[PDB]
Ligand binder design. Structure first.
Ligand SMILES: O=C(/C=N/O)NCCN1CCCN(CCNC(=O)/C=N/O)CC1
Lengths: 540, 540
């Protein structure tokens, strides 16, 4: 028995577990309950705090994963299954995990809080790529990762009603942040230096915590990796969320014909159906065929989000706030396999122009025919208008810039020009053990394994260059967690990471080579998405 | 007595003059009348052939310049005075010139036929830069230059009428080509090899002779130097041409206060007016403040133009035809000091962002406010959106591409893809004796000096490098006139000139350096003008 694996929080006593890294052990506490199980009558309702328990709750393994869709388009394939659930599915899933160094820090240490992505329909903090044992050992910080309700269980919204207000998944993350602010000190963590970081939908969640007033006091810094709250996929209107919720109820037999009708009878009927039944009809409520679009997503109700994310970003004071932000080299290449015509992960995807003209409608859904002609213009090399190799990566840029790159660059510039300290990066390293085809380059979400120091795992087949490269990135992220500056506090030998300003627009390239400063997060392409096309949609 | 300076044509006998070049003499016949003077009741009417005369007509000096506006914006400035008339103005101006080598060729020699430009409102074959003594002596070819009516006297059109049909200025050029087919052999020229070549509005006129059936039988090859018939300035609609004709009549006092205003009474009142009075109200007819727009231009009417130039270029067959087209490096830079705000030839024209936003409305007149923002989007550096030096060259590209570069690139692509053998060039040499400011680079029309061998004149301060450079260009144009191929027939040593096709789109940079093959005649920019902007103006 180690005296450090026994820790008492405000709810009760816990028993952690020691993990083994090549450089030392780490005390981990996996599966702490931070909310009452949202089952039965609590489905679609905001979370309630965990009632205090008697005894010692076992915290030596990851708890259950929230109910979600499971990708089966490529069985056995590691590229898709690495994000699939690794524990059993249950609505009793609201748990968090805390990693702390050994020996436990005597002084308060900055805290990192990870929010997994997964398009607000999937994800779990128990994934092997989110194993934070390598970060808290190499940088001696504290890491906390929580589970939140995805799918309809976390984002089915009947706005205005009480039985289904929506954004209950975002409230799950907020309750975990309140838990960290009240209990991370018992693990040696500094609640006055909490840094949020997330990827994809988790990055969009970090951005919505910047814009929600009740959540701002629960952290101090933010990191958004390949995601932003102002994306075309990260929010839906009240009128659309009500239509998607009513269609899901109809697909499962709610209301029973013929009874109706109001929101009270509709949600009460939804609570009687099994959880997996609701999941089996999640994708059948999307309005049209598309990629990078998800069914149940954070809504602009008016409570958690007083206005649309775009408006709050433009009318907010961001002084005294440090933000890290970046994207990968090929954001859209991952999503083309899931809908774009003529795309297969097992060939070269040398598409024809007819397939390219059709793919723009899938990549850019719900838009006028004239607006499609404008997208075809900007992303077509007119010296070689039918080269399959160029058309392939052109549509990859379309989906990447429309959903991730330009919504992120829009957010990064407005933050710096309004008082926030902003740093920008572009991840340009493809892992040697990547199972996706070559033409995808660096897919969506394949920098997470380097942030958490996965190449340090001796059971993996990474190169010696990638191990040193992962330690640089871990120190980049940890330095931002401590001082809000990724540059070394004193070390001048390493190249400098200049802040991203609204005018200069400077970012760095994260790869095996040293830092390289560049200007423009696809400024020419993103001016089409952020400036002209909105004016093209008002005059239909 | 040199018996080579007295030649008999179908009209009568002529008397030429010997002019000396550093390489030898050349016989010239300047001022041959090819039509009865269009005065009095002949104003605005098509030309009629010159009746035969008695005795010897003196052809020693250039005749009179057609009535036209004279530029007085910069008095004494050679950059503008070089295009102003050098002979006195008169309505009796329909005269042509022929240059023939000495000794006169005993074998029929291919003929080059020059059509001067100047926005269909000015110009004269008597300009010093149109001297064909060097082009004829160095390559032993027959040069023929003509005068055609400009301004209202050549292009005022009341469509459907009989006294103001329009395109009578283009009919003057046709009559001169008929004169060449009947009399160029008397000077030693081959009427079965005539090659039209013009610049600006003259280059457009060369294109309109390609699209006119009654004129296609009068030549075999074509050269369009920075000008195309499908440009937004080369033609005008029926209804607008009538409004511009009625606008001019009102400003001069037609009809008198109290009388009717049909087409017959309007022109009869116009014929009773002094020629200079009509010229003094030409620019007060344009519908708005603009540049690269002219009052009286050729009119699509169903006679000389059975349809619009763009329609005839698309539905035309051009087998058995070889064309040579091209542009200068800085087309629109010259027109910016004629209306664009913040421009001045005496400073560096470092304009502001607001001046650039207003210049697009002047450079691109009569477009929806939404259409201009698409132009602003495509022609601004979004990383340096406020740099005056970049905004200056940007607006130069806007006027250059919209009026010249893109209308020409579309024509060359349609000609090659439908039978014609097209050759494309880009002139990139700034003359060492140029008087315009340096930021204009290579302005509109400053390659004519080198084609006509002007640097060979000993009374000028051209460098020795430009003298060899001019001889290269005179041979390119002469080889095209002889065989239809600008490359040397007996030479694989010198760099070759690949034809321009609709697929590869290869062109050549003409400079002191050897030939350099490039691809794409501003493809990315011209795809916005030729393809997208029509689709946007349709949905307005
Ligand atoms: O990868 C991440 C997060 N990484 O952290 N984002 C989700 C990527 N999605 C890509 C496209 C949508 N969708 C495909 C699966 N379902 C279907 O579209 C049709 N199924 O039948 C989900 C996967």
């Amino acid at each position: 028995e180690d005296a450090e694996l026994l820790v008492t929080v405000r709810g009760g006593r816990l028993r952690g577990i020691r993990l083994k890294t090549p450089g030392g052990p780490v005390s981990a506490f996996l599966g702490i309950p931070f909310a009452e199980p949202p089952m039965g009558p609590r489905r679609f309702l905001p979370p309630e705090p965990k009632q205090p328990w008697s005894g010692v709750v076992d915290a030596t393994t990851f708890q259950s994963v929230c109910y979600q869709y499971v990708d089966t388009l490529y069985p056995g394939f590691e590229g898709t299954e690495m994000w699939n659930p690794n524990r059993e599915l249950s609505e009793d899933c609201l748990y968090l995990n805390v990693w702390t160094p050994y020996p436990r820090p005597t002084s308060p240490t900055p805290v990192l809080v990870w929010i997994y992505g997964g398009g607000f329909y999937s994800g779990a903090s128990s994934l092997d790529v989110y194993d934070g044992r390598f970060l808290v050992q190499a940088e001696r910080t504290v890491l906390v990762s929580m589970n939140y309700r995805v799918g309809a269980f976390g984002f089915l919204a009947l706005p205005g009603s009480r039985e289904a207000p929506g954004n209950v998944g975002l409230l799950d993350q907020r309750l975990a942040l309140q838990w960290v602010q009240e209990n991370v000190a018992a693990f040696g963590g500094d609640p006055t230096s909490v840094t949020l970081f997330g990827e994809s939908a988790g990055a969009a969640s970090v951005g919505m915590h910047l814009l929600s007033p009740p959540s701002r006091g629960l952290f101090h810094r933010a990191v958004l990796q390949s995601g932003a709250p102002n994306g075309p996929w990260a929010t839906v209107g009240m009128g659309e969320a009500r239509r998607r919720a009513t269609q899901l109820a109809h697909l499962v037999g709610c209301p029973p014909g013929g009874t109706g009708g109001n929101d009270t009878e509709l949600v009460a009927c939804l609570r009687t159906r099994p959880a997996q039944v609701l999941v089996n009809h999640e994708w059948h409520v999307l309005p049209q065929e598309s990629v990078f679009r998800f069914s149940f997503v954070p809504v602009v109700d008016g409570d958690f989000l007083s206005d649309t994310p775009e408006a709050l970003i433009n009318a907010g004071d961001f002084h005294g706030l440090q933000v890290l932000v970046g994207v990968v080299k090929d954001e859209g290449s991952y999503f083309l396999v899931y809908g774009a015509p003529g795309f297969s992960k097992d060939n070269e995807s040398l598409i024809s122009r007819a397939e390219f003209l059709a793919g723009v409608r899938v990549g850019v859904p719900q838009v006028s025919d004239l607006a499609a002609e404008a997208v075809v213009l900007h992303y077509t090399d007119w010296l070689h208008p039918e080269d399959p190799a160029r058309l392939r990566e052109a549509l990859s840029d379309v989906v990447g810039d429309h959903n991730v790159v330009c919504p992120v660059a829009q957010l990064a510039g407005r933050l710096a020009a309004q008082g926030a300290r902003v740093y920008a990066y572009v991840f340009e390293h493809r892992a040697s053990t990547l199972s996706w085809p070559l033409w995808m380059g660096v897919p969506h979400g394949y920098e997470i394994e380097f942030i958490f120091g996965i190449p340090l795992d001796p059971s993996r087949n990474y190169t010696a260059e990638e191990k040193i490269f992962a330690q640089r990135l871990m120190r980049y992220w940890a330095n931002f967690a401590r001082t809000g500056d990724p540059n070394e506090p004193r070390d001048p030998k390493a190249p400098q990471w200049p802040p991203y300003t609204a005018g200069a627009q400077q970012y760095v390239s994260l790869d095996l080579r040293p830092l390289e400063v560049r200007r423009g997060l696809r400024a020419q392409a993103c001016a089409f998405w952020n400036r002209f096309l909105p004016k093209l949609l008002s005059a239909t």
